[PDB]
Symmetry: C2
Subunit: 127 residues, 2 copies
């Protein structure tokens, strides 16, 4: 595959990614280091300067919630996970997400990436 012709030029693709109207995040390695985050992501979690750092290292408080257990499973097994209405902590929100593995040409897993959707309105609509 010629990436420039079939996906797009790297700079252009990044500019589109940045602006996609959905929370997008890419992670690399066993320690889930941030490699790509967009504006909808950075607005969802404004406490940041994330690229290059392990997810645990920038969000130390999220150990108990085990978002990290689920990320490790995806990275170790290659099995994608979807979740609905996973709750979080303010500075009470609910999230749908799909996490998939990223494989190299050799079939090994280099990382995971996610799409996240904020569905708090649907849940808080529990009157």
């Amino acid at each position: 595959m010629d990436w420039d012709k079939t996906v797009g030029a790297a700079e252009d693709v990044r500019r589109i990614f940045e602006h996609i109207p959905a929370i997008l995040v890419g992670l690399e390695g066993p320690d889930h280091r941030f490699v790509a985050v967009n504006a909808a992501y950075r607005g969802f979690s404004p406490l940041l300067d994330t690229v290059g750092q392990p997810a645990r290292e920038v969000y130390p408080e999220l150990e108990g919630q085990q978002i990290y257990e689920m990320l490790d499973r995806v990275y170790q097994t290659g099995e994608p996970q979807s979740g609905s209405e996973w709750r979080l902590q303010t500075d009470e929100r609910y999230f749908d997400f799909v996490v998939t593995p990223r494989r190299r040409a050799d079939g090994s897993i280099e990382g995971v990436q996610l799409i996240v959707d904020d569905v708090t309105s649907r849940v808080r609509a529990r009157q």
Copy 2:
């Protein structure tokens, strides 16, 4: 904003974009030229080699459906549009999508990008 530090390095971001588990597409200019498409996009529309070309020029049959009317409105006005269960043609499918404008530093619109979701199962479930 330092893009490498806040979004990610251009190559890395493109690799994550490619693998996002959602149909993603970026367009540029008035003629909606393809600048970025991912694997979920290219699987959704396999009749391709799209990057660099106007949407009308690669999909000449879609003039009547006026997906192009809606793309022009977003590009001209800056008003985002969302659609539900817009139908298409086989080689009978239904699509949710969100299209937004992309603004330059000067506030002018350079293009649009979309996220598309295939919701045919929900609709074909009209027994």
